[PDB]
Amino acid sequence: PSGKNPVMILNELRPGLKYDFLSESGESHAKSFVMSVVVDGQFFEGSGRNKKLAKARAAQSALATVFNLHL
RNA sequence: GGUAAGGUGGGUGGAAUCCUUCGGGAUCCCACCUACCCUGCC
Numbered sequence: 798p799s800g801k802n803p804v805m806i807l808n809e810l811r812p813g814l815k816y817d818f819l820s821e822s823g824e825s826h827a828k829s830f831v832m833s834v835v836v837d838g839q840f841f842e843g844s845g846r847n848k849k850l851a852k853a854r855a856a857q858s859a860l861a862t863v864f865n866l867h868l
Numbered sequence: 869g870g871u872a873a874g875g876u877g878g879g880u881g882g883a884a885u886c887c888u889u890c891g892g893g894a895u896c897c898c899a900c901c902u903a904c905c906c907u908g909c910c
Contacts (some may be wrong), residue, residue, distance in 0.1 A: 799883055800899040805897050809885055812895070821875095826908035828875045846876065849898085 800848065803857040803868050807836075810864060816852065834859045 799805070809812075819831040819842075831844040832851035836859040843854025861867050 798899050801899085802897075805884065808896055812885060823875095825875055826873080828909080830875090852897095 801838070802853040803860050804852050805865070806868075807856050807860040810860075813837075814859065816855075818848065831855075837863045839863060 798832055814834060814836040817833045821828060821830045821834055823829050829844055829846060830851045831838065831842060832848065832855045832867070833842045834855050835841075839859070839862060841855045841859040841862070843851050843856070843858060845851040845854055857868050
């Protein structure tokens, strides 16, 4: 699969970044997680119900800002 | 007992960029399978 997230778009348009996962909360049926990034020296964040959703949110923010575009 | 929703681990497969002595190296994503955790309905 070529991908399903804004993560791969960013990582193909302009790679050269770092990511930092952050802790979780809630019960197993309402669980949440978060994922942050450092791109071009900027910083971004994005929580979600799972690890992929977190990175998709944070990477979409990192993309739109650093790329001066939108998803 | 059956039915449905979400999360995590493990295994396998698929996919992209960068570098390369073309043997390889680095970065990175997804799906499937299996097990586990947990909630809703009847």
